[PDB]
């Protein structure tokens, strides 16, 4: 179709097939099998890489297990490495690294899989390429006897920042709770201290949620197992690269909560079979809306929302029921349910 921006011709000494690797101006990478004796072009491969036109380069003998393989890195809006393993063609991205051009690199120090390159920021840098996603290892798994007293309970994400993630663990014996906060890809320190976590005492979280009642602050709501609902305030320091947690108040609830989410501006909990919508007040949480559910809904274990209008409610034994928000009525109205008994975990 479009004008070629780069092209490279490679023979794999393993198979003996000739491959023609072509990059285009619209960010599309193509690959060709060249017939040897005649020269016919077979087995057409195509993948859209990015916005920039595709630049190619070639890496002679890189190791897969960390058997020889050759790979062609593909340069565009992002980088892609394009290899063949066990006669399966693979094209995957590279871990957080834009490259303008790329070449192999060998020392006594860096014996295998070394690579030197010019980054898009403009710096020249030496590296290793390590874990190629084959079909038996699609994911690269990054991290005396090593046993913790704390058990992980829930992982949360901030509403406005997609990159920040909050972690909550429970102590196995002492009714404590620790909280970690990893912004972007690194953990933050607690206040001005040395540690990377804050331990809350006399709390174990059944469920939790991070909710922005207003658009400039973020709040952690914990549901404790003692029928309490606790509000904290998350204060990330940004330059000291630290967070803080800070109690606001404690609110009493009738029943345990297993599902809670942000519904437009408030906190939407399910306690037992009751759907309760809460607003932030400065002495306690304030319940703005209370809806009772149909009779066969016994516990709610899961809910989800579609653009602050519809509500999908999941019962422990029955199934899904769908509700619509009545703004004038200030309640949720049920309008569909299911024919069989489904024991919902997540919806």
């Amino acid at each position: 179709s479009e004008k070629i921006s780069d092209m490279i011709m490679v023979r794999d000494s393993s198979i003996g097939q000739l491959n023609l690797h072509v990059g285009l101006e619209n960010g599309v990478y193509m690959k060709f099998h060249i017939g040897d004796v005649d020269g016919s072009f077979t087995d057409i491969k195509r993948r859209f890489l990015g916005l920039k036109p595709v630049s190619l380069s070639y890496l002679r003998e890189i190791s897969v297990s960390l058997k020889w393989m050759s790979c062609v890195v593909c340069h565009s809006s992002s980088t892609w490495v394009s290899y063949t393993w066990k006669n399966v063609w693979t094209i995957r991205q590279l871990k957080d690294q834009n490259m303008l051009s790329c070449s192999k690199f060998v020392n006594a120090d860096v014996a295998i899989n070394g690579v030197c390159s010019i980054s898009s920021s403009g710096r020249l840098n030496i590296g290793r390429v390590s874990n190629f996603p084959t079909l038996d290892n699609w994911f690269h798994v990054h991290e005396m006897l090593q046993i913790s007293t704390f058990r992980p309970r829930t992982i949360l994400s901030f509403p406005n920042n997609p990159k920040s993630i909050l972690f909550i663990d429970n102590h196995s014996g002492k009714k404590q709770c620790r909280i970690s906060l990893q912004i972007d890809g690194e953990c933050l320190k607690f206040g001005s201290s040395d540690h990377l976590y804050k331990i809350l005492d006399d709390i174990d979280c059944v469920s939790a949620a991070i909710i922005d009642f207003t658009r400039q602050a973020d709040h952690l709501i914990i549901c404790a197992g003692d029928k309490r609902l606790l509000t904290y305030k998350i204060l990330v320091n940004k330059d000291k690269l630290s967070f803080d947690i800070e109690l606001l108040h404690q609110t009493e609830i009738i029943s345990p909560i297993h599902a809670m989410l942000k519904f437009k501006n408030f906190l939407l909990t399910a306690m037992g079979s009751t759907i309760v919508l809460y607003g932030l007040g400065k002495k306690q949480l304030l319940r703005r809306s209370v809806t009772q559910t149909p009779v066969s809904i016994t516990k709610i274990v899961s809910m989800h929302q579609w653009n602050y209008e519809r509500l999908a409610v999941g019962d422990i034994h029955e199934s899904v029921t769908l509700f619509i928000w009545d703004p004038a009525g200030n309640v949720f109205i049920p309008y569909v349910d299911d024919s069989v008994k489904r024991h919902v975990t997540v919806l």
């Binding site: 007040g281 400065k282 002495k283 306690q284 304030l286 319940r287 703005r288 809306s289 209370v290």
Partner: peptide, 27 residues
Amino acid sequence: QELELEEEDEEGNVMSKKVYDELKKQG
């Protein structure tokens, strides 16, 4: 054949909708 309104003095937590709408008329 128990909702809440926040009294501006903040201690209105233990009240009601219907109590707060009466105090719209007293206020």
